[PDB]
């Protein structure tokens, strides 16, 4: 599940991930490795019309979380519930959902 998850592609660089996100609509999302371990653990990236929004996933004692909300067993399920509704609970400015799941492998194509 974890290495796959469709939206997560193992070790990835920010530049390549923004190139993958390019020209997609709002609500689009995908997860990327954090540049350094001292910086964080993983980066959720959103899309909000041309503007790319970067959210940190921090890993604690088996707990994955953006900030105060940390009670999540894995990064996969955290991202899952976070997609269901909007991330306005965590950050009011994030008043959009992870609805658009444009990150599926182009095997179908």
Swiss-Prot record:
Origin superkingdom: Eukaryota
Record domain SH2: where: 7-102
Entry coiled-coil feature ranges: none
Documented effect of changing residue 83 to Q: In a patient with severe insulin resistance; lower insulin-stimulated lipid kinase activity compared with wild-type
Disulfide bonds: none
Maturation and modification: Polyubiquitinated in T-cells by CBLB; which does not promote proteasomal degradation but impairs association with CD28 and CD3Z upon T-cell activation. In adipose tissue, polyubiquitinated by the BCR(KBTBD2) E3 ubiquitin ligase complex; recognized by KBTBD2 through the SH2 domains, undergoes 'Lys-48'-linked polyubiquitination leading to its degradation.
Known tissue expression: Isoform 2 is expressed in skeletal muscle and brain, and at lower levels in kidney and cardiac muscle. Isoform 2 and isoform 4 are present in skeletal muscle (at protein level).
Subunit structure: Heterodimer of a regulatory subunit PIK3R1 and a p110 catalytic subunit (PIK3CA, PIK3CB or PIK3CD). Interacts (via SH2 domains) with CCDC88A/GIV (tyrosine-phosphorylated form); the interaction enables recruitment of PIK3R1 to the EGFR receptor, enhancing PI3K activity and cell migration. Interacts (via SH2 domain) with CSF1R (tyrosine phosphorylated). Interacts with PIK3R2; the interaction is dissociated in an insulin-dependent manner. (Microbial infection) Interacts with HIV-1 Nef to activate the Nef associated p21-activated kinase (PAK). This interaction depends on the C-terminus of both proteins and leads to increased production of HIV.
Protein family (similarity comment): Belongs to the PI3K p85 subunit family.
Function: Binds to activated (phosphorylated) protein-Tyr kinases, through its SH2 domain, and acts as an adapter, mediating the association of the p110 catalytic unit to the plasma membrane. Necessary for the insulin-stimulated increase in glucose uptake and glycogen synthesis in insulin-sensitive tissues. Plays an important role in signaling in response to FGFR1, FGFR2, FGFR3, FGFR4, KITLG/SCF, KIT, PDGFRA and PDGFRB. Likewise, plays a role in ITGB2 signaling.
Related illness: Agammaglobulinemia 7, autosomal recessive: A primary immunodeficiency characterized by profoundly low or absent serum antibodies and low or absent circulating B-cells due to an early block of B-cell development. Affected individuals develop severe infections in the first years of life. SHORT syndrome: A rare, multisystem disease characterized by short stature, anomalies of the anterior chamber of the eye, characteristic facial features such as triangular facies, lack of facial fat, and hypoplastic nasal alae with overhanging columella, partial lipodystrophy, hernias, hyperextensibility, and delayed dentition. The clinical phenotype can include insulin resistance, nephrocalcinosis, and hearing deficits. Developmental milestones and cognition are normal.
Domain statement: The SH3 domain mediates the binding to CBLB, and to HIV-1 Nef.
Name of the protein this chain belongs to: Phosphatidylinositol 3-kinase regulatory subunit alpha
The organism of origin for this protein: Homo sapiens (Human)
């Amino acid at each position: 599940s974890l290495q796959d998850a469709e939206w997560y592609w193992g070790d990835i660089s920010r530049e390549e991930v923004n190139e993958k996100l390019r020209d997609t609509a709002d609500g689009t999302f995908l997860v990327r490795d954090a540049s350094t371990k001292m910086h964080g653990d993983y980066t959720l990236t959103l899309r909000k019309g041309g503007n790319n929004k970067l959210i940190k996933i921090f890993h604690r004692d088996g707990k994955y979380g953006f900030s105060d909300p940390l009670t999540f067993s894995s990064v996969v399920e955290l991202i899952n519930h976070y997609r269901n509704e909007s991330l306005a609970q965590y950050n009011p400015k994030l008043d959009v959902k992870l609805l658009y799941p444009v990150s599926k492998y182009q095997q179908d194509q």
